[PDB]
Design an enzyme around this catalytic site. Structure first.
Site, PDB file in Angstrom:
ATOM      1  CD  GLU A  59     -21.098 -13.428  11.285  1.00 35.64           C
ATOM      2  OE1 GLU A  59     -21.383 -13.543  10.075  1.00 35.64           O
ATOM      3  OE2 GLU A  59     -21.128 -12.333  11.885  1.00 35.64           O
ATOM      4  NE  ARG A  60     -14.819 -14.580   6.451  1.00 34.93           N
ATOM      5  CZ  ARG A  60     -15.582 -13.922   5.590  1.00 34.93           C
ATOM      6  NH1 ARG A  60     -16.352 -12.919   5.975  1.00 34.93           N
ATOM      7  NH2 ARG A  60     -15.571 -14.278   4.309  1.00 34.93           N
ATOM      8  CE  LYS A  89     -21.546  -9.209   0.429  1.00 32.67           C
ATOM      9  NZ  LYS A  89     -20.402  -8.896  -0.466  1.00 32.67           N
TER      10      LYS A  89
HETATM   11  N1  LIG Z   1     -19.736   3.190   4.492  1.00 37.50           N
HETATM   12  C1  LIG Z   1     -18.428   2.857   4.602  1.00 37.50           C
HETATM   13  N2  LIG Z   1     -17.496   3.781   4.916  1.00 37.50           N
HETATM   14  C2  LIG Z   1     -16.195   3.466   5.027  1.00 37.50           C
HETATM   15  N3  LIG Z   1     -15.712   2.229   4.841  1.00 37.50           N
HETATM   16  C3  LIG Z   1     -16.534   1.204   4.521  1.00 37.50           C
HETATM   17  C4  LIG Z   1     -17.970   1.469   4.380  1.00 37.50           C
HETATM   18  N4  LIG Z   1     -18.546   0.297   4.062  1.00 37.50           N
HETATM   19  C5  LIG Z   1     -17.566  -0.636   4.005  1.00 37.50           C
HETATM   20  N5  LIG Z   1     -16.369  -0.094   4.280  1.00 37.50           N
HETATM   21  C6  LIG Z   1     -15.075  -0.812   4.305  1.00 37.50           C
HETATM   22  O1  LIG Z   1     -15.266  -2.214   4.135  1.00 37.50           O
HETATM   23  C7  LIG Z   1     -14.370  -2.933   4.980  1.00 37.50           C
HETATM   24  C8  LIG Z   1     -15.052  -4.171   5.534  1.00 37.50           C
HETATM   25  O2  LIG Z   1     -15.677  -4.857   4.458  1.00 37.50           O
HETATM   26  P1  LIG Z   1     -17.085  -5.589   4.681  1.00 37.50           P
HETATM   27  O3  LIG Z   1     -18.068  -4.574   5.196  1.00 37.50           O
HETATM   28  O4  LIG Z   1     -16.826  -6.858   5.447  1.00 37.50           O
HETATM   29  O5  LIG Z   1     -17.485  -5.962   3.170  1.00 37.50           O
HETATM   30  P2  LIG Z   1     -18.044  -7.407   2.750  1.00 37.50           P
HETATM   31  O6  LIG Z   1     -18.801  -7.899   3.953  1.00 37.50           O
HETATM   32  O7  LIG Z   1     -18.912  -7.098   1.566  1.00 37.50           O
HETATM   33  O8  LIG Z   1     -16.821  -8.209   2.408  1.00 37.50           O
HETATM   34  C9  LIG Z   1     -13.942  -1.990   6.086  1.00 37.50           C
HETATM   35  O9  LIG Z   1     -12.523  -2.015   6.237  1.00 37.50           O
HETATM   36  C10 LIG Z   1     -14.414  -0.621   5.654  1.00 37.50           C
HETATM   37  O10 LIG Z   1     -13.323   0.289   5.524  1.00 37.50           O
HETATM   38 MG   LIG Z   2     -19.879  -9.367   5.146  1.00 40.55          MG
END
Ligand SMILES: Nc1ncnc2c1ncn2[C@@H]1O[C@H](COP(=O)(O)OP(=O)(O)O)[C@@H](O)[C@H]1O
Ligand SMILES: [Mg+2]
Ligand SMILES: Nc1ncnc2c1ncn2[C@@H]1O[C@H](COP(=O)(O)OP(=O)(O)OP(=O)(O)O)[C@@H](O)[C@H]1O
Ligand SMILES: [Mg+2]
Lengths: 49, 528, 570, 109
Positions: free
Chosen positions: C283-284, C257
């Site tokens: 927020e972390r 996300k």
């Molecule tokens: N478009 C993307 N391309 C590659 N990796 C992605 C993408 N979107 C998310 N990720 C992966 O998600 C991980 C981080 O998760 P995050 O974005 O914090 O998801 P959430 O916030 O939903 O838990 C990263 O390590 C990354 O590799």
């Molecule tokens: Mg997130």
């Protein structure tokens, strides 16, 4: 330069569609008037005169 | 004059102190605009829940209040029609102007009228939905629940039912409980666009309004409906929705110190809704002679009908229209599940012509579903297999309907009779065919000089089979045949179409001249 | 009069207006790949590896009426947006109420008032000074004339019995102006991006005050009618985002996300030329620092206003982050007439903070232990996002669904306000598909005929139907083998596979993980590519070519190049 | 009275917004059917009006977008006498004859 330029789609669609609506309505009204006159001419004579 | 002093302000409630004869739901005035209602009281103090809010009024400990000594009564003003109001009467959006003269004042918890003041429900309520009007009828004075998941079309169904009263002289009342103001403004715009604004009111309590306002909004709407009923008017009320009202009541009771019960709701959650929904029905000539029809809306979670509030509400209304999420995902609109939907009034709520037309369609629909889900081997029983696979698919095609599209009651009945007489066998999923048929029938029954009398005969009296056959054969079928043969090319070679429409009179010569004169696409004799 | 027209513009305004400069095609043919890429990056269209395609993209962006309008206005004297119904700052008062702490507990403190010039109001703030540090306590319940209860906004360390407290009889206020862009603060306005705490210059506004003359004013709103362009193929084609509405980002943990949030921030600031407000709730600290650093690196930091209610702060402080972000967005729309895209993450933590505050203040818990005022609080947060004559406030809010339980009361409260739901799948991400948006589960209310064309609706419906049918047929393929399909079923499956893989896209922010440059795809390009794929035109190309591309032509060019190399190799 | 029966058939539609309008006042010599063009959302009606006081023939087009506007447009027949107020639409630049939107209208048949 030549390969960059290309035919737009918005104005072309708008203008074409408007001209199609006008031509369709004109053609329909002509066909309606001819059809009706054909119906009138089909049943328009005195039996005895 | 002021006789109360504020002592504490906690839990969003005000604790007034003073010596007075407090009564339940007695209006207490803190200014000329802000007032609350008494919830609990003793011989020296009371607890009050505010209904309003003022920016310039800063309520605090030590503020003065006046106990008016009158119960909470909503006043009726002439400019309610075509307006959005709140639970206290203020006009948030108005089309006309007020006169500052109260036509009446109705107590919100007005007890339901007794048994001897009632009458049988026998007059149809038009909802504009073919499946509802033919299989799940709604009578004037019925309580029909619209229950389903989120984003499935419950509000759309209620708005469609409220749009079909454009020319029926039925008042519309729409109560919004914790809805978004954007959606309410959109509904106001739709009302104005569809020519029912002058006939409708909208009571609104937003999601961030005071909890007392959201609790008492449906009762204020019912009080307004009772005012209109007392002068012999048929009122159609929609509550959107009662799950938000249950949540508001639970929040108000929990913040006031009341003990939680099953699912954290208070112990008398069933009484709160039963004493609300029992105020609708049909009343006798000596007691008003009108009716109040209620369409409460309830939200389920992933199809869970067995929830507390949904099962409380099912056991109060006279049937339910259940909207399925699977049909909505599959693209069926309106997504109404006929198997799980009931109308306990039945043919008693249908007119004689509609009862004759739609007799025994639910059985055929269930048989078609049973066959479709259990075709199994390719072996076929007889021609009856094709009969079912034809009529069931024709009915299913009749089910579909665009949004905000009002289909008249007689048009639906005529469509049912055409289906039952085999005049839709040629259908091969061409929506324009049914669109043409519906439009032609609607214009013929609404504007034609003889079609208007035909429609009046269908509405008032109950015709038999032979007279209906004469009506169909000598007027309706020639018009339908001409208006179908001039729009659908494939109908020229459709073997079923010739097999059914060969002997029908040709009327092209007259309908041509009617078209060339600017007449609508259904006039067959002349404009009345 | 160039001197006169330039005299009404500040140097920074001229710097910004250098973006909206019209370049003739004769000039544009003479640029190099490096200059064209710099122009595309400056205008937010993303990198391009072809010359003529880059010129065509630049011309398409320039030929737009909004771009031409901005370019034409950039050569005229400055016209100032006249603010009707602005936000009025708080009034200047003195410290009029004095008292001291008489009861202590975890996160709740009772205050007895001694010297008052006026009676205490609900939600006002009491300030305490301990060791040169200022602590704010928000009032909850007024028991009698001289006795109130309060909860901390921040850290409760240092408070004790008899700590003197003073109040202006006002709710908490923060300093807002245009200088808030590029800075990181907390809900109460404490500086978080440097140790010296350089102040923010602006006026003090109270985020809890709506400043409405009457309730009827809250009904003067314009229902949503426009679709925001994001540049993401799946979102544009299948899940249009309302402008002035709300979009929820739903999923479990690690679905991705935050990457979508960063990409949308960048696309709105660069391509749409607007102002972004980020409001982190719970927020972390690590994630906040990381997002701040990448905002600085990617160049959208100077146009973003960050508010961070950190995970380690008191629940009262965590609750106010959404309200502060909404107040900043309201200021940026009403006072400056700018469209704002407000980001919220995470809504579940906002609900949890509200539940914590309700439980702390001795209130009877509702079902599943939540607060009785759950729906009321959710409405209070979400009802201030709307669309008015002054501009649009679009919201894109990320939510965490615990254990995929969509019947949780927090989720049920949230769906009451979402205008478009985008649901992420952990299985689809684990398959390597990114942005890992589930097209079958997600849906948008703006995919109708009221807002889109007939072609867009037909393409979206056909795409969803093909994806569902190929999902059904894949199980048959797995069990009985690919031969058991009919002749039409094989074509349906191949088209569905190519459609599913064509929806993947590289983002300009995700270059840290895979190292692949990002792309920005217009709605027309995505529609044309999906239309080409649906017809079966590209059915002779291996599926591996359809992954992580920008437009339909890239696959064809790569396949042609590989075929040429294979023909040369033998 | 010849016009006595025409009074009961008056139908008046109006908008509370006031724009600049072109006023037509006369009989409808010929009116065709309705066409749906903008994604089947609008209604296009070609009108031939013989004006009052000059008795000249003018050709216009009428556009309907809402349910109430289509209902008002459907009331116009041949030989109908109208006092129509019409807002000019910017799509006439691609049309032989002007395209209009009904602001106020009074219809007698
Ligand atoms: N478009 C993307 N391309 C590659 N990796 C992605 C993408 N979107 C998310 N990720 C992966 O998600 C991980 C981080 O998760 P995050 O974005 O914090 O998801 P959430 O916030 O939903 O838990 C990263 O390590 C990354 O590799
Ligand atoms: Mg997130
Ligand atoms: N007959 C129809 N044809 C097409 N779309 C329809 C139809 N009926 C409803 N819709 C659409 O379905 C969606 C859901 O409708 P609606 O808002 O009435 O449902 P609801 O059950 O009240 O939902 P909510 O959970 O948002 O309160 C809307 O986008 C609406 O436009
Ligand atoms: Mg709804």
């Amino acid at each position: 330069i030549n390969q960059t330029k290309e035919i737009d789609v918005n104005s072309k669609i708008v203008k074409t569609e408007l001209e199609y609506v006008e031509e369709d309505s004109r053609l329909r009204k002509e066909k309606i008037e001819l059809i009706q006159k054909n119906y009138d001419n089909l049943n328009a004579k005195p039996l005895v005169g | 004059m002021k006789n109360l002093k504020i002592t504490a302000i906690k839990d969003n409630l005000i604790f007034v102190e003073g010596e007075h004869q407090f009564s339940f739901l007695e209006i207490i005035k803190f200014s000329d605009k802000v007032e609350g209602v008494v919830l609990k009281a003793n011989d020296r103090s009371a607890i009050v829940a505010i209904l309003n809010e003022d920016k310039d009024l800063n309520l605090t400990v030590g503020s003065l209040a006046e106990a008016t000594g009158e119960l909470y009564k909503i006043p009726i003003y002439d400019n309610y029609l075509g307006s959005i109001i709140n639970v206290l009467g203020e006009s948030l959006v108005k089309q006309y102007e007020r006169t500052n003269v109260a036509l009446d004042k109705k107590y919100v918890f007005t007890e339901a009228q007794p048994i001897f003041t009632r009458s049988a429900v026998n007059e149809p309520l038009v909802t504009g939905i073919t499946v509802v009007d033919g299989v799940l009828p709604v009578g004037r004075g019925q309580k029909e629940l619209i229950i389903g998941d989120r984003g499935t079309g419950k509000t759309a169904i209620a708005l469609n039912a409220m749009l079909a009263q454009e020319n029926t002289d039925v008042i519309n009342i729409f109560i919004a409980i914790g809805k978004k103001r954007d959606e309410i403004v959109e509904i106001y715009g739709t009302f104005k666009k569809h020519n029912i604004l002058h006939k409708s009111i909208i009571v609104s309590a937003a999601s961030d309004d005071a909890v007392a306002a959201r609790y008492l909004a449906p009762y204020a709407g019912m009080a307004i409906a009772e005012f209109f009923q007392q002068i012999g008017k048929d009122v159609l009320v929609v509550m959107d929705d009662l799950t938000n009202h249950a949540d508001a009541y639970r929040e108000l009771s929990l913040l006031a110190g009341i003990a939680p019960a099953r699912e954290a709701y208070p112990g008398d959650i069933f009484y709160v809704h039963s004493s609300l929904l029992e105020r609708g029905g049909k009343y006798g000539p000596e007691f008003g002679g009108g009716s109040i029809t209620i369409l409460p809306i309830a939200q389920t979670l992933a199809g869970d009908i067995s929830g507390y509030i949904p099962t409380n509400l099912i056991s109060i209304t006279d049937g339910q229209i259940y909207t399925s999420a699977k049909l909505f995902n599959e693209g069926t609109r309106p997504a109404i599940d006929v198997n799980l939907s009931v109308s306990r009034l039945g043919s008693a709520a249908q007119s004689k012509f509609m009862a004759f037309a739609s007799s025994g369609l639910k059985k055929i629909y269930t048989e078609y579903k049973y066959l479709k889900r259990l075709s199994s081997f390719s072996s076929k029983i007889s021609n009856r297999d094709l009969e079912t696979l034809q009529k069931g698919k024709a009915f299913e095609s009749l089910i579909d309907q665009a949004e905000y599209e009002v289909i008249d009651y007689e048009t639906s009945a005529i469509l049912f009779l055409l289906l039952k007489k085999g005049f839709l066998n040629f259908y091969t999923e061409k929506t324009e065919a049914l669109k043409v048929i519906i439009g032609v029938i609607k214009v013929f029954l609404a504007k034609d000089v003889l079609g208007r009398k035909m429609r009046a005969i269908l509405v008032e009296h109950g015709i038999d089979s032979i007279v209906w056959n004469l009506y169909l054969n000598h007027m309706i079928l020639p018009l339908l045949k001409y208006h179908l043969l001039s729009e659908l090319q494939y109908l020229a070679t459709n073997r079923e179409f010739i097999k059914k429409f060969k002997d029908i009179r040709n009327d092209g010569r007259i309908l041509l001249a009617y078209e060339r004169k600017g007449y609508e696409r259904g006039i067959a004799y002349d404009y009345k | 009069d160039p001197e006169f027209v330039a005299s009404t513009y500040t140097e920074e305004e001229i710097i910004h207006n250098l973006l909206f400069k019209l370049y003739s095609v004769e000039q544009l043919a003479l640029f190099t790949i490096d200059q064209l890429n710099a122009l595309l990056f400056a205008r937010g269209l993303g990198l391009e590896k072809n010359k003529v395609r880059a010129i065509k993209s630049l011309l398409t962006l320039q030929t737009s009426y909004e771009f031409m309008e901005k370019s034409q206005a950039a050569l005229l004297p400055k016209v100032s947006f006249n603010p009707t119904n602005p936000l009025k700052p708080i009034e200047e008062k003195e410290f009029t109420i004095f008292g001291e702490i008489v009861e202590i507990r975890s996160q709740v403190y009772k205050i007895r008032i001694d010297k008052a010039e006026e009676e205490v109001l609900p939600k006002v703030i009491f300030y305490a000074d301990v060791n040169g540090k200022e602590i704010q306590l928000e009032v909850a319940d007024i028991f009698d004339k001289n006795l109130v209860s309060t909860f901390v906004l921040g850290n409760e360390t240092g408070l004790k019995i008899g700590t003197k407290v003073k109040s202006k009889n006002q709710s908490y206020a923060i300093k807002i102006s245009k200088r808030l862009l590029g800075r990181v603060i907390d809900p109460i306005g404490k500086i978080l991006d440097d140790s010296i705490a350089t102040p923010v210059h602006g006026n003090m506004y109270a985020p809890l005050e709506m400043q409405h003359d009457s309730e009827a004013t809250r009904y003067v709103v314009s229902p949503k009618n426009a679709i925001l362009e994001t540049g993401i193929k799946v979102i544009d084609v299948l899940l249009p985002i309302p402008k002035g509405g709300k979009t929820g980002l739903l999923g479990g943990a690690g679905v991705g996300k935050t990457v979508i949030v960063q990409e949308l921030i960048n696309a709105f600031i660069k391509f749409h030329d607007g102002v972004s407000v980020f409001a982190g709730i719970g927020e972390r600290i690590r994630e906040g620092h990381e997002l701040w650093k990448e905002a600085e690196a990617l160049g959208f930091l100077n146009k973003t206003a960050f508010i961070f209610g950190q995970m380690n702060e008191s629940p009262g402080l965590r609750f106010r982050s959404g309200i502060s972000g909404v107040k900043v967005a309201e200021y940026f729309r009403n006072n400056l007439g700018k469209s704002v895209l407000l980001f919220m993450d995470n809504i579940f933590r906002y609900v949890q903070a509200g539940s914590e505050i309700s439980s702390l203040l001795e209130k009877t818990p509702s079902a599943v232990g939540y607060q009785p005022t759950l729906f009321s609080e959710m409405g209070q947060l979400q009802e201030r996002i709307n669309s008015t004559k002054d501009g649009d406030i679009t919201s894109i809010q990320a939510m965490y669904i615990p254990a995929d339980d969509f019947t949780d009361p927090a989720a049920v409260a949230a769906f009451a306000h979402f205008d478009s739901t985008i649901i992420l799948s952990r299985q689809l991400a684990a398959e390597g598909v990114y942005p890992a948006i589930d097209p079958l589960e997600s849906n948008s209310k703006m995919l109708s005929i009221k807002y889109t064309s007939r072609e867009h609706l037909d393409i979206a419906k056909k795409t969803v139907q093909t994806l569902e049918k190929t999902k059904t047929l894949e199980d048959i393929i797995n069990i009985l083998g690919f031969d058991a399909l009919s002749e039409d079923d094989k074509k349906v499956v191949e088209v569905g596979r190519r459609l599913k893989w064509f929806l993947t896209q590289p983002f300009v922010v995700a270059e840290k993980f895979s190292g692949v440059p990002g792309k920005f795809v217009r709605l027309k390009d995505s529609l044309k590519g999906i239309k080409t794929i649906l017809d079966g035109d590209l059915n002779h190309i291996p599926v591996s070519y359809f992954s992580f591309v920008g437009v339909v032509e890239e696959i064809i060019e790569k396949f042609n190049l590989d075929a040429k190399k294979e023909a040369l190799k033998n | 009275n010849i016009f006595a029966n025409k009074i009961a058939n008056q139908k008046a539609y109006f908008k509370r917004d006031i724009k600049t309008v072109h006023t037509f006042l006369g009989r409808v010599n010929y009116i065709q059917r309705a066409s749906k063009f903008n994604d089947e959302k609008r209604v296009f009606r070609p009108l031939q009006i013989e004006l009052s006081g000059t008795n000249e023939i003018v050709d216009i087009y009428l556009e309907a977008t809402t349910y109430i506007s289509k209902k008002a447009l459907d009331e116009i027949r041949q030989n109908s006498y109208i006092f129509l107020e019409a807002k000019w639409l910017p799509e006439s630049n691609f049309l032989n004859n002007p395209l209009f939107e009904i602001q106020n209208i009074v219809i007698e048949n």
